[PDB]
Write a protein that binds this ligand. Structure first.
Ligand code: HEM
Length: 147
């Protein structure tokens, strides 16, 4: 759902997470560590492994879309409609068997990459606001994927 305080914490820490590369470095770290930890997930993405060039490319696109979702957080119906559309496109991505269960371990890796970039700015309040935001953003994508 996200409270106004949680929307405000994610909107303000996104400025630091985005940096000067629109979160591309965070995206690269997230998917590289995720695929190094679960080699079994490389086939779901259609990648050869964690060092496939496609990992850094996908990481930049995922984090750029989270930046769009963050700018629309004040209108939930807008944010979920656009994330559902992203989700509908995932029916035809990677192996065409992307499952909802895969999104929760990916969330842990995203939060970790975010904290690695902004350090202490990713305090307990920021981690809770971003876990709440990642739950809504991925939840809406999963809804498009299962539609
Ligand atoms: C573990 C779950 C996920 C899997 C397996 C997955 C897989 C993929 C794959 C394989 C592509 C490349 C498409 C191509 O070849 O053209 C893709 C694109 C994309 N993914 Fe995901 N994805 C996942 C999670 C996410 C998340 C959390 C977001 C949330 C913002 C996201 C956003 C996107 C975006 C924006 C694109 C670019 C193309 C588009 O807009 O549809 N993905 N994803």
């Amino acid at each position: 759902g996200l409270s106004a305080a949680q929307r405000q914490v994610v909107a303000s820490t996104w400025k630091d997470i985005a940096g000067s590369d629109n979160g591309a470095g965070v995206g690269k770290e997230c998917f590289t560590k995720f695929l190094s930890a679960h080699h079994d997930m490389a086939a779901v993405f259609g990648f050869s492994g964690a060092s496939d060039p496609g990992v850094a490319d996908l990481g930049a696109k995922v984090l750029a879309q989270i930046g769009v979702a963050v700018s629309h957080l004040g209108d939930e119906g807008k944010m979920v409609a656009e994330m559902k559309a992203v989700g509908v496109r995932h029916k035809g991505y990677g192996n065409k068997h992307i499952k909802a269960e895969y999104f929760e371990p990916l969330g842990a890796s995203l939060l970790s990459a975010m904290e690695h970039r902004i350090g202490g700015k990713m305090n307990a309040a920021a981690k809770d606001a971003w876990a709440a935001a990642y739950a809504d953003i991925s939840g809406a994508l999963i809804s498009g994927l299962q539609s």
